[PDB]
Design a binder for this molecule. Structure first.
Ligand SMILES: CC(C)=CCC/C(C)=C\CC/C(C)=C/CC/C(C)=C\CC/C(C)=C/CC/C(C)=C/CC/C(C)=C/CC/C(C)=C/CC/C(C)=C/CC1=C(C)C(=O)c2ccccc2C1=O
Ligand code: SF4
Ligand code: SF4
Ligand code: SF4
Lengths: 125, 191, 165, 38, 183, 406, 220
């Protein structure tokens, strides 16, 4: 199998750590191994997405210089055959914007490990 | 002079400049025609606009302001109309026309293009055509020694036109109207 | 009839009058003396911080733009007269609306608002100004804040204004 | 008389003039979208 | 563009510096404004000040000609899609100035209706405090953006700068962990 | 039928103020149907008010209809005072300064309206001259309040602080120069042939239309009805001022523009009257249980609570300290009840429904903003005309979208 | 009716919304009643307005329509019973002696503790001819938040019935199209209802953050 590569985007290193903690090397033993590419800045995330080869992108809607929802909209408008996007929302009322970002799934802060894992499995399945 | 005025109005119209400025009409159509254009394509549209301004100002200079001939304060100077000075005089006249463009832009709002077409067809075209006649008749009379008659006709003609145009500006565009009738909305009592 | 052309006479006239633009940034214009510029944490003449950390400024802030944490003025390290001083004092200038309710709230005048306004950053965090960035500069005759109160003086003396360098 | 007609509905992922507005009962309001639009 | 294919010698450095000088000047704002911050932006354009001195008087009506998007006011939930559309319909290079506390962090309106900072939807280059920022503050932020634009890299230098900025950003702790002197 | 486009004037458009969305069905370039799309500048100010005390929600209300900050503040403070039963206890100086600031703000708001309308209609220099006059007005506002916009200077029971010693001289200079400088702006537009052709007969709305949509302000008074909340239902002591309600009979865009231009001069006259009647005295109610305890003063360290007030509260007065602490932290408690208070904002009747549940926070604060109601006239004043006429009509409505959405 | 309208029951001194900081002060029970029915000799022109309204409306119809009359701070409010709102609005607009042609809008207010009357719609009406003004109040339960729309009588109530709906869910039955005007159509909930959370985010600080004001402690 091919290590599924997941892009974790957040200016906050602790959000990236939590995302990587919820999703281990294997979300389930039936699923392939997972390799994480951490990106703290929007330019790096966009360039990585352009390089392709990602199975999922987790974008923090609370990212300081460039929010995850904006990056999600940008990638789904700029990359052809871009992978499913999961957005982390800083509040419940952000749900509407999460829908606008066209992200395949939205997980509110604080990141529930189990909710995030279930959403990731659903997106990769 | 009537030909000069009609031509000047038509100059401002041709260059898409204020107070006509219709194709762009920033306040109305965002960017007008050059919306969806960026970079040097927009740059070239604006370059064409400005080159047209310069070309038509130079045409006005050629046809009405004596082209490159030196103005009166310098006309008396020997050699002013010869050598490279004519270039200076021509540039000066062209830039006076450019200043007129900028002044019009700073002072006047932009017309509705229906209003501009009304100006063109109900004022400019009739005035220019009447002037063409008047001028032809005047020159023919002068060539035949009529003299005074021409000096009369011309003046009378303009005296009429400035009045008639005034009517279009003041009489045709009436500034009074009747009040509207009330309806179910139970209008209050007016003063 | 020339009335319709009055506008021309306006613009042409202004073309010969001196432009009225303020010369900012080279020659910045004069702001009002009362302008609501950057907050500033002030000191007493001897150098002690005025802020007692009462949090009234933060309390009154409509935008929750002030964070204040008080602490005891232990004899080993005293920063303000009295029992309490504000050891952590942060203003989130991306939430500050310059209303001035904070200064009107202060009971010590520890918080004022200067006329300085030039302030901007490419980073959100950099605009959360802490105590170090807000404290007024240590003037002549002042001492480092961690020092005992002026001899033969008490908090009431500081508030009554009976202290000197 | 039908005071200025309800604007086209604004939704996440859809805000064009062709989108009808949502009535309280969840149904699309006919007046929100111009009759000419498909 | 081919300017991004140039070798990293003195040629690329000079192209970068001249492009930065050219772009810092003639930095046309988009004809865009949400609230009272828009009024202060107009005042900055007004005679008392002169945005024009900086080559920035042409407020591009269409985003195609716009180079800078001064958000200049609060961004509601329903407006964020529109603001993002305007941003995407500008042509690179683009810069976003978050004018005012509302545009930068939501300001005093910390509630459902406001986006809590336009950086949620568009990359912000400079944050401008104030409610509204006085026109001098806007000019200060604009000059800061000019300084940023002047030092903007290109091509291979741009890629190296992106990598270095990423490396630096991956290490910075979050603001919630700067517990300096907090009891 | 199938030959007419449907277009979005959209939020981002020079004449739509960035958040207004006119959806126009154009048959060629004639507006056939004109839907209005609102809420792109919704802010939750009305709900967010409910989580802040009185004297704090002032800072919120001044930011809806941000071109008329003093009007929002005055409406809010009048509502609070009426709920308190304090309207008759407000100091005379505070009321006079309120009237003076409201009229200067009317001049400023009309200047912005004229500037943006001229800019939309191509009158480029109109914006610059209007903002040149507004610059002097805002200098006065900044000196009085320390802010250029969104002032929180008018507070429940009076003002945030007394005028600075130089304020009266600056306002007198304004009274002297505003007519002369407004002469420049009027010369650009008033009699200009293009301006009149561009606005005369455009955006017509009869008195019946104004009543049906509940229009108010210059739009209504362009129908000849001299309705003004300052004469009818006087407030802040407007009854003591000799001024004429400006009204025209054209019922179109040009009539509204002339009404605003003349309202500027009427405001200048009212400000001259205010200066004549301005006398030294307190600017906040004498009741210490409600009076704002802060006493701002300037010093070498900036603006802050005056050293005398610091001495009083921290040195000698326990009651003074308690009152300062509580009135600053929790604020006053307003007896429960409902009150609808209306003022004549530059754009019409600015109404405020204020409900208190007896607590330290406004239970409910709703602004009937005149722009919200006036925008219902876009369909009437735009359908049938050209898009160029729609621009003029909308500009004549002079909608400030902050008040529209709130 | 005829009793004071309690909109909230406040218990405990110092406006504590919960158990309270200091022990022993929480036993007070103070109902928060809005001003009740005014005694008949209303002030100023309110007496004339009400007499005319009771003359135009039949005694039975008047009693069925006008639920209450309040005069607070020299302002007249008429608690108009739901259902009967269009009739009284028509009477007020059309009656020459009343002639309240200018309706200034509709304001929603939510009283989650006012059983059966949680949602109130306020209609400020002004008569320019008589230089008078009044307010109508129409209550509706949270269970059936329906009110008769005044679109036929006061077209200006259009968009107001919408705003009030958008922010409260009052259905204003009969409105030509009651669509959200401020919030997006996909929006869930009605923001200005007291039960709808403020929806803010914590304010970020170095090492700390301040929750939104709705989460933090308050006294009223
Ligand atoms: C190919 C090649 C390289 C060749 C070599 C030669 C070469 C280099 C080129 C040759 C020369 C060329 C072609 C050069 C390129 C440049 C070129 C062609 C032209 C571009 C430059 C140009 C056209 C200059 C002049 C433009 C000009 C007159 C600009 C002034 C515009 C003005 C007056 C702007 C001010 C507008 C303004 C006040 C902005 C505010 C906008 C706001 C506030 C928006 C939001 C908003 C609005 C809109 C409200 O009105 C409002 C009202 C009330 C409440 C709220 C609001 C609100 O929110
Ligand atoms: S700045 Fe003033 S109000 Fe704030 S904690 Fe310090 S003394 Fe108290
Ligand atoms: S100016 Fe107002 S918003 Fe800013 S910190 Fe002071 S009190 Fe808070
Ligand atoms: S930051 Fe202040 S001035 Fe700017 S939009 Fe927000 S409230 Fe208005």
């Amino acid at each position: 199998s091919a290590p599924l590569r997941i892009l974790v985007y957040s200016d906050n290193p602790r959000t990236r750590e939590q995302v990587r903690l919820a999703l281990g090397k294997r979300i389930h033993p039936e699923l392939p191994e997972i390799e994480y590419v951490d990106v703290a800045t929007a330019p790096m995330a966009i360039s990585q997405m352009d390089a392709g080869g990602f199975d999922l992108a987790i974008l923090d809607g609370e990212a300081t210089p460039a929010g995850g929802m904006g990056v999600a909209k940008q990638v789904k408008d700029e990359i052809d055959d871009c992978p499913p996007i999961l957005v982390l929302t800083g509040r419940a009322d952000d749900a509407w914007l999460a829908k606008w970002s066209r992200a395949e799934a939205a997980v509110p802060h604080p990141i529930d490990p189990i909710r995030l894992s279930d959403a990731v499995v659903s997106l990769l399945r | 002079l009537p030909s000069f005025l009609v031509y000047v109005v038509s100059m401002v119209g041709e260059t898409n400049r204020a107070p006509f400025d219709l194709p762009e009409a920033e306040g109305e159509l965002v960017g007008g025609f050059h919306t969806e254009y960026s970079s040097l394509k927009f740059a070239m549209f604006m370059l064409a606009e400005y080159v047209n301004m310069t070309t038509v100002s130079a045409l006005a200079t050629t046809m009405f302001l004596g082209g490159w001939h030196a103005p009166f304060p310098f006309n008396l100077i020997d050699g002013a109309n010869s050598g490279w000075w004519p270039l200076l005089w021509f540039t000066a006249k062209v830039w006076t026309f450019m200043f007129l463009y900028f002044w019009l832009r700073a002072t006047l709002p932009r017309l509705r293009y229906d209003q501009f077409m009304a100006l063109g067809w109900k004022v400019l075209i009739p005035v220019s055509l009447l002037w063409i006649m008047v001028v032809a008749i005047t020159r023919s009379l002068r060539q035949h020694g009529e003299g005074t008659w021409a000096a009369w006709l011309l003046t009378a003609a303009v005296v009429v036109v400035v009045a008639l145009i005034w009517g279009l500006a003041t009489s045709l565009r009436r500034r009074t109207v009747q009040p509207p009738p009330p309806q179910s909305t139970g209008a209050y009592p007016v003063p | 009839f020339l009335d319709a052309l009055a506008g021309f006479a306006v613009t042409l006239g202004s073309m010969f009058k001196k432009p009225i633009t303020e010369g900012y940034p080279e020659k910045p214009g004069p702001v009002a003396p009362r302008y609501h510029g950057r907050h500033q944490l002030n000191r007493y003449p001897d150098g002690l911080e005025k802020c007692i950390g009462c949090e009234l400024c933060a309390w009154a802030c409509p935008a929750d733009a002030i964070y204040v944490e008080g602490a005891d003025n232990t004899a080993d390290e005293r920063y303000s007269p009295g029992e309490r001083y504000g050891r952590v004092y942060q203003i989130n200038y991306l939430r500050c609306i310059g209303c001035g309710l904070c200064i009107e709230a202060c009971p010590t005048r520890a918080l004022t608002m200067t006329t300085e306004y030039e302030m901007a950053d490419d980073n959100r965090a950099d605009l959360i100004w802490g105590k170090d960035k807000l404290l007024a500069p240590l003037q002549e005759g002042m001492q480092a804040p961690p020092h005992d109160m002026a001899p033969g003086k008490t908090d009431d003396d500081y508030y009554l204004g009976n202290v000197t360098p | 008389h039908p005071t200025p007609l309800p604007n086209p509905g604004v939704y996440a992922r859809h805000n064009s003039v062709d989108v009808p507005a949502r009535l309280p009962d969840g149904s699309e309001s006919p007046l929100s979208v111009s009759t000419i639009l498909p | 563009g081919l300017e991004e294919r140039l070798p990293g010698g003195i040629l690329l450095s000079t192209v970068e510096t001249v492009a930065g000088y050219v772009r810092k000047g003639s930095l046309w704002p988009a004809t865009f404004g949400l609230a009272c911050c828009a009024i202060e932006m107009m005042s900055t354009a007004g005679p008392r000040f002169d945005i024009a001195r900086f080559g920035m008087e042409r407020f591009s009506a269409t985003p195609r000609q716009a180079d800078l998007m001064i958000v200049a006011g609060r961004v509601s939930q329903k407006m964020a899609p529109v603001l993002r559309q305007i941003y995407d319909q500008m042509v690179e290079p683009k810069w976003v100035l978050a004018m005012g506390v509302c545009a930068s962090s939501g300001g005093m309106f910390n509630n459902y209706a406001v986006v809590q900072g336009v950086d949620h939807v568009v990359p912000v280059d400079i944050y401008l405090p104030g409610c509204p920022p006085r026109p001098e503050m806007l000019l200060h932020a604009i000059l800061k953006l000019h300084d940023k634009i002047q030092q903007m890299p290109l091509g291979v230098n741009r890629e190296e700068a992106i990598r270095e900025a990423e490396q630096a950003a991956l290490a910075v702790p979050p603001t919630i962990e700067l517990k300096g002197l907090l009891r | 039928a199938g030959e007419r486009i449907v277009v979005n004037m959209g939020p981002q458009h020079p004449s739509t103020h960035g958040v207004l969305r006119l959806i126009l069905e154009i048959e060629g370039e004639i507006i056939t149907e004109a839907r209005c799309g609102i809420g792109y500048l919704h802010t939750g100010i009305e709900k967010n008010l409910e989580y802040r005390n009185w004297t704090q929600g002032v800072t919120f209300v001044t930011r809806m209809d941000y071109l008329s900050p003093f009007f929002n503040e005055t409406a809010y403070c009048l509502g609070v005072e009426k709920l308190l039963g304090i309207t008759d206890d407000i100091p005379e100086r505070a009321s006079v300064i309120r009237v003076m600031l409201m009229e200067l703000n009317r001049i400023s708001s009309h200047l912005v309206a004229l500037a943006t309308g001229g800019m939309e209609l191509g009158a480029m220099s109109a914006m610059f001259y209007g903002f040149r006059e507004r610059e002097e007005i805002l200098r006065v506002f900044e000196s009085i309040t320390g802010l250029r916009m969104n002032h929180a200077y008018i507070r429940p029971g009076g003002l945030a602080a007394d005028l600075p010693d130089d304020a009266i001289t600056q306002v007198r200079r304004l009274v002297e120069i505003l007519p002369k400088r407004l002469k420049d702006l009027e010369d650009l537009l008033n009699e200009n042939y293009i301006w009149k052709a561009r606005t005369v007969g455009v955006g017509y709305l009869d008195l019946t239309g104004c009543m049906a949509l509940g229009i108010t302000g210059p739009i209504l008074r362009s129908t000849g009805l001299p309705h003004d909340l300052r004469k009818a239902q006087p407030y802040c002591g407007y009854e003591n001022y000799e001024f004429d309600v400006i009204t025209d009979d054209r019922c179109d865009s040009y009539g509204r523009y002339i009404i605003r231009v003349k309202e500027m001069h009427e405001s200048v006259k009212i400000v001259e009257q205010c200066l004549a009647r301005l006398k030294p005295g307190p600017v906040m109610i004498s009741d210490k249980k409600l009076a704002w305890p802060a006493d701002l003063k300037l010093g070498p360290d900036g603006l802050g609570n005056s050293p005398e007030h610091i001495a009083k509260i921290m040195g000698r007065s326990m009651e003074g300290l308690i009152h300062h602490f509580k009135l600053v932290t929790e604020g006053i408690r307003v007896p429960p009840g409902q009150v609808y208070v209306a003022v004549e904002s530059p754009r019409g009747e600015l109404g405020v429904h204020m409900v208190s549940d007896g607590g330290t926070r406004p239970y409910r604060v709703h602004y009937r903003d005149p722009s919200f109601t006036n925008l219902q006239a876009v369909a009437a004043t735009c359908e049938g005309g050209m898009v160029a006429d729609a621009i003029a009509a909308v500009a004549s409505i002079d909608p400030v979208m902050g008040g529209v959405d709130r | 009716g005829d009793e004071p309208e309690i909109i909230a029951v406040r218990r405990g001194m110092f406006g504590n919304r919960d158990t309270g900081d200091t022990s022993g002060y929480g036993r007070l029970v103070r109902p928060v009643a809005l001003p009740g029915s005014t005694p008949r000799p209303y002030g100023g022109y309110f007496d004339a307005v009400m007499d005319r309204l009771a003359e135009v409306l039949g005694e039975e119809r008047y009693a069925m329509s006008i639920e209450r009359v309040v005069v607070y701070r020299d302002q007249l409010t008429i608690e108009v019973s739901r259902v009967q709102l269009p009739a009284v609005a028509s009477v007020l607009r059309d009656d020459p002696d009343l002639r309240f042609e200018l309706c200034l809008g509709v304001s929603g207010v939510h009283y989650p503790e006012d059983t059966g009357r949680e949602l109130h719609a306020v209609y400020p009406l002004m008569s320019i001819t008589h230089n008078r003004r009044i307010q109508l109040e129409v209550a509706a339960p949270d269970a059936d938040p329906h009110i008769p729309s005044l679109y036929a009588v006061y077209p200006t109530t259009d968009w107001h019935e919408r705003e009030t709906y958008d922010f409260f869910g009052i259905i204003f039955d009969g409105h030509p199209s009651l669509t959200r005007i401020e919030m997006p159509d996909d929006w869930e909930g009605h923001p200005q209802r007291k039960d709808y959370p403020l929806g803010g985010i914590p304010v970020e600080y170095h090492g700390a953050q301040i929750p939104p004001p709705d989460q933090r402690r308050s006294y009223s």
